[PDB]
Design an enzyme around this catalytic site. Structure first.
Site, mmCIF file in Angstrom:
data_model
loop_
_atom_site.group_PDB
_atom_site.id
_atom_site.type_symbol
_atom_site.label_atom_id
_atom_site.label_comp_id
_atom_site.label_asym_id
_atom_site.label_seq_id
_atom_site.Cartn_x
_atom_site.Cartn_y
_atom_site.Cartn_z
ATOM 1 N N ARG A 1 28.249 47.753 -0.363
ATOM 2 C CA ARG A 1 29.449 47.975 -1.137
ATOM 3 C C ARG A 1 29.127 48.681 -2.457
ATOM 4 O O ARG A 1 28.449 48.104 -3.266
ATOM 5 C CB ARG A 1 30.201 46.656 -1.339
ATOM 6 C CG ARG A 1 31.465 46.704 -2.186
ATOM 7 C CD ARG A 1 32.500 47.736 -1.778
ATOM 8 N NE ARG A 1 33.208 48.178 -2.962
ATOM 9 C CZ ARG A 1 33.823 49.348 -3.101
ATOM 10 N NH1 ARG A 1 33.854 50.251 -2.132
ATOM 11 N NH2 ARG A 1 34.455 49.603 -4.225
ATOM 12 N N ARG A 2 29.709 49.870 -2.668
ATOM 13 C CA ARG A 2 29.398 50.775 -3.766
ATOM 14 C C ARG A 2 29.575 50.141 -5.142
ATOM 15 O O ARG A 2 28.719 50.361 -6.029
ATOM 16 C CB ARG A 2 30.067 52.124 -3.606
ATOM 17 C CG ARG A 2 29.401 53.011 -2.563
ATOM 18 C CD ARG A 2 30.220 54.287 -2.412
ATOM 19 N NE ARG A 2 29.525 55.426 -1.834
ATOM 20 C CZ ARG A 2 28.839 56.357 -2.510
ATOM 21 N NH1 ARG A 2 28.725 56.293 -3.828
ATOM 22 N NH2 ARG A 2 28.206 57.314 -1.901
ATOM 23 N N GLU B 1 30.469 52.425 8.965
ATOM 24 C CA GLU B 1 29.023 52.279 8.981
ATOM 25 C C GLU B 1 28.588 51.100 9.862
ATOM 26 O O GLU B 1 27.775 51.262 10.757
ATOM 27 C CB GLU B 1 28.489 52.130 7.556
ATOM 28 C CG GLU B 1 28.678 53.306 6.634
ATOM 29 C CD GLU B 1 28.720 52.917 5.157
ATOM 30 O OE1 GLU B 1 27.971 52.021 4.755
ATOM 31 O OE2 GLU B 1 29.544 53.499 4.398
#
Lengths: 659, 71, 82
Positions: A522-523, A595
């Site tokens: 998670r960015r 992803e």
């Protein structure tokens, strides 16, 4: 700025120098008591004073310099050094801290030269390495270390023998919770790289600093990222180390980092750290503007020179860029297809109050005849420009020019002139952007084989070739229709379709030989940890792909899923909140979902890595049905204290032992 | 050529025989590198790398002749 | 191999005193003594601090004793004077 202002500055300088000399004396009387609280207080006053001096709008640099001189002249500097390196200082480490902070403020070029002349350098270095008990000590340590690294090649090389690079790495690895540690680390790395020979650079590379620069450039802190971009672009400025930085992936962060900033805004953010940026340090950055260097390095250098132009306007010392001749290199970059660098160089010249020459667009097919004329002019073929104009040559037609057209219609009779010209044209052809036309990302495909091949892009594209067709080409078609007379290049393309019949199959086959591990995370939460994991695995020799470099609005990279398909192994970094945006994402809109779904579809040795605070979502039924199974998988609990054991466990999951 | 030769092809050629240094820049600029040499035909060598001297071609051929070898 | 960069390497790796003492151990024959005085003299081509640090070994007394033992070798006298 007026002569009235030169006078006002000189007046202010003399005035405030007199004042701050007296105040510094008072603080030195407290230091001279040789009592803990008095040394601490005196040093605190000197620290505050020096920072206030550096924050003084115009006279800051001169006033700092004059006080650095006064500190040497009064032996105050010498006394601080002696009192800092003293073993008795273990009575109160805060004495060493305040002494060191003051020394940090006072590390002007002449003061560092004084340190070197008196041979205090290694004494200070070791005592900085002893400053390790707290993040504050560690920051100060990295500061003094980085400041020592602002001095000539032999000194930096001599300090490499201390192995302090490993201490630096361990320091930021211990305390990534502090942005200021990452700043002083990235600073130290930028400084040492900028202030060291080839041999020392090689030693720094042997400490696998390109990988750590990936980590540093992946920090959320823009100042760390700035220094990390400079540091890696210093490495990238040497041919032999470009592959090592390519293996680090760090170049891919560089241009995005620049793109999300304006140099003057960043200058205003950076100012407290910009204080004490130096002429010789600029002279050493100047080579990174050169046409020989990477677009990345030129872009960083250009952005940096814009920042410096901003700061030197404020300090009213813009003359420096004329003195070092950088104005010419900025004009060259402004009149270049390095569009990012060209913009920043134009902006730098704008802040200098210099002229901005004619701009050039990377989308060269779009060029007007005026652009062609300008280019021809600039590459020195001026005598032909009239003939180019008469021939009405444009961005299309340039890209077709065979020697015959030069020989006849341009009347360029010299074969040598033709050779020379064509070399530039080839360079330009390689350099150009063809996303203007390339629906198929054929150019990207070719670049993946080698960017060299981009010479053929425009020909093939205009001949109606696209990415889907390429498997079907004969040697003849390649040779003739695509003009690839070089059989070695033809062999290269042959080697693509030797592996498989379709470009995606070919690229996934290729990519498998470039990707061991894909990292999903998670960015907004996992960036730093995912990057640390990537770097540690790259230090352990594994080829790691990651989604760090920001994609734009919409327009998701499906090649990210091809990267997962090409990978052997897939990591999911489970931070706090990591799975939360996947909740009720049945339509697979979340890229973490895309992803992870891809990872499941291909059974890629799948590795949940639980961050130290992590818990799964409350409601498993709200995690989509396709990926919900992940709540039943084994994974590595990350522990910051046991990084090495956690990474050993990650290796076990990569070797399929625990999944 | 180390200014440009990532592959130390120059060094390789010198080691093979010093005069072969002569070809370095041509083949390098054609995009040849130390790994690719095994793959070249006499034709590719003669034409693309311009090594018209068959003796020199034979020399490098000798390099590629020799560059091989719970229940 | 005692180039400036090689002497610098010795200093950078801190082999200096190890090499010095081992040169002082090279004493058994005029050849050992000459080589000793040579390596000793070569280390003395590094900067002031290194030479001063090597004075603290008192190798000067060893040098004196070495040439005093074997002055009948001109090469010993050369490497001493060097």
């Amino acid at each position: 700025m007026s002569n009235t202002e030169q006078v006002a500055m000189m007046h202010t300088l003399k005035t405030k120098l007199s004042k701050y000399q007296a105040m510094m004396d008072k603080a030195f009387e407290e230091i001279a008591k040789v009592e803990d609280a008095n040394i601490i207080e005196g040093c605190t006053i000197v620290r505050k004073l020096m920072r206030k001096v550096w924050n003084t709008p115009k006279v800051s640099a001169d006033l700092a310099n004059a006080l650095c001189d006064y500190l040497r002249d009064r032996d105050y500097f010498d006394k601080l050094i002696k009192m800092f390196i003293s073993p008795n200082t273990a009575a109160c480490d805060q004495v060493r801290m305040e002494c060191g902070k003051v020394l940090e403020e006072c590390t002007s070029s002449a003061n560092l030269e004084y340190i070197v002349n008196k041979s205090y350098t290694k004494k200070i270095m070791i005592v900085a390495m002893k400053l390790n008990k707290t993040p504050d000590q560690q920051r100060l340590s990295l500061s003094l270390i980085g400041n020592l690294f602002k001095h000539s090649n032999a000194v930096s090389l001599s300090l490499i023998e201390t192995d302090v690079i490993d201490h630096i790495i361990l320091t930021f690895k211990r305390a990534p919770e502090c942005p200021d540690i990452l700043r002083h680390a990235a600073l130290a790395l930028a400084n040492i790289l900028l202030y060291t020979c080839f041999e020392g650079k090689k030693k720094i590379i042997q400490k696998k600093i390109p990988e750590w620069l990936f980590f540093l450039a992946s920090q959320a802190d823009d100042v760390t990222r700035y220094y990390a971009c400079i540091a890696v672009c210093t490495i990238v400025s040497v041919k032999e180390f470009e592959p090592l930085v390519r293996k680090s992936d760090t170049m891919k962060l560089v241009e995005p980092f620049l793109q999300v900033h304006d140099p003057a805004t960043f200058a205003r953010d950076y100012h407290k750290y910009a204080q004490g940026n130096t002429k010789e340090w600029l002279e050493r950055l100047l080579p990174m503007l050169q046409p020989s260097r990477r677009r990345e390095a030129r872009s960083v250098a250009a952005f940096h020179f814009t920042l410096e132009a901003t700061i030197k306007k404020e300090q009213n010392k813009l003359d420096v860029f004329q003195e070092i001749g950088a104005i010419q290199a900025l004009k060259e970059v402004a009149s270049s297809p390095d569009e990012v660098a060209a913009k920043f160089a134009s902006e730098a010249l704008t802040v200098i109050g210099e002229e901005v020459p004619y701009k050039l667009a990377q989308q060269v097919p779009g060029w007007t005849c005026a652009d062609v004329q300008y280019w021809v002019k600039k590459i020195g073929f001026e005598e032909y420009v009239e003939k180019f104009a008469k021939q009405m040559v444009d961005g299309d037609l340039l890209l077709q020019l065979t020697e015959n057209d030069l020989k006849h219609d341009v009347g360029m009779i010299s074969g040598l002139h033709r050779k020379r010209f064509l070399r530039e044209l080839q360079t330009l052809k390689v350099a150009a952007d063809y996303s203007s036309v390339d629906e198929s990302n054929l150019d990207n495909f070719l670049m993946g084989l080698s960017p060299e091949l981009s010479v053929y892009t425009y020909q093939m594209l205009t001949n109606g070739v696209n990415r889907s067709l390429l498997s079907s080409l004969t040697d003849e078609m390649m040779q003739n229709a695509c003009g690839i007379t070089n059989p070695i290049h033809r062999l290269k393309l042959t080697q693509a379709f030797e592996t498989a019949k379709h470009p995606d199959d070919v690229e996934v086959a290729m990519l498998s030989k470039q990707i061991d591990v894909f990292i999903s995370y998670r960015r907004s939460t996992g960036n730093q940890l995912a990057s640390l994991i990537k770097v540690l695995l790259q230090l352990r020799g594994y080829r790691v792909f990651i989604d760090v470099d920001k994609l734009y609005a919409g327009k998701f990279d499906s090649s990210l899923l091809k990267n997962i398909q090409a990978a052997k192994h897939f990591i999911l970094v489970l931070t706090p909140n990591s799975l939360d945006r996947l909740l009720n994402d049945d339509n697979c809109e979340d890229w973490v979902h895309k992803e992870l779904k891809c990872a499941f579809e291909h059974q890629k040795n799948i590795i949940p890595i639980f961050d130290t605070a992590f818990e799964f979502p409350t409601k498993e039924d709200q995690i989509p049905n396709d990926i919900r199974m992940i709540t039943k998988y084994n994974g590595v609990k990350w522990v910051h204290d046991y990084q090495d054991a956690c990474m050993a466990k990650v290796v076990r999951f990569i070797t399929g032992e625990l999944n």
